[PDB]
Design a binder for this molecule. Structure first.
Ligand SMILES: CC(C)c1cc(C(=O)N2Cc3ccc(F)cc3C2)c(O)c2cnoc12
Length: 218
């Protein structure tokens, strides 16, 4: 009795190409010698703060939206043994449709405009003025995983190593309840961001007036 499941039904892991504009910005960022790479953390904290603002406001008109977690917070977890730096917020999260669209497609206009500004003399620290600061993660990471959970959808995992494509799959792993978890698989030359004195240094410098608590775990 050796049955064979020849058809699973749904495709478990889906692979898609970025819009060319996004892929080209990602290649620029992952390979640049720009020497102020710590700005990646400000950009991720800024995205977390925006997502936390969003669930905070929706919870005013609908307090049940906080059933998936009442505290609004940011946690930062360096992991030397896995060479990862993780940021987890309890913001509004993203549905599958918005996860694919926002990271894979809709960022095209911002990444294109940003590359044009860079060619004209702008600097990489301006990336957030184009609405695409997330991709500054590749200043320090060779691979980025985004786990996200929105009240209206199930938990999903996105990942890309900036080779032109990303994958999205349902995440049946540890529930995050609500929010977004960004896992940075760090470049070998960027492991200073696995150290607590360094991470705290960067948070104090760039994110000192963020309106949510930021906790560091070691
Ligand atoms: C992947 C990147 C774009 C990102 C998205 C969200 C997220 O789920 N967002 C961002 C955002 C911004 C505005 C808004 F209305 C809703 C949302 C949902 C985050 O909380 C973080 C944290 N670091 O990187 C993040």
């Amino acid at each position: 009795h050796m049955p064979e499941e020849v058809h699973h039904g749904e495709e478990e892991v889906e692979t898609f190409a970025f819009q060319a504009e996004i892929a080209q910005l990602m290649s620029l960022i992952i390979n640049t010698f720009y020497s102020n790479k710590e700005i990646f953390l400000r950009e991720l904290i800024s995205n977390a703060s925006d997502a936390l603002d969003k669930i905070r406001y929706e919870s005013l008109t609908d307090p049940s939206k906080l059933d998936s977690g009442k505290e609004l917070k940011i946690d930062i977890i360096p992991n030397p043994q896995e060479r990862t730096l993780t940021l987890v917020d309890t913001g509004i999260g993203m549905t599958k449709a918005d996860l694919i669209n926002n990271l894979g497609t809709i960022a095209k206009s911002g990444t294109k405009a940003f590359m044009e500004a860079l060619q004209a003399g702008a600097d990489i620290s301006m990336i957030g003025q184009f609405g695409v600061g997330f991709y500054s993660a590749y200043l320090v990471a060779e691979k980025v995983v985004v786990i996200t959970k929105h009240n209206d959808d199930e938990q999903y995992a996105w990942e890309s190593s900036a080779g032109g494509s990303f994958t999205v799959r349902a995440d049946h792993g540890e529930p995050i309840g609500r929010g977004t978890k960004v896992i940075l698989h760090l470049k070998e030359d960027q492991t200073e961001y696995l150290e607590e004195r360094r991470v705290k240094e960067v948070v104090k410098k760039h994110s000192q007036f963020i309106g949510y608590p930021i906790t560091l775990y070691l």
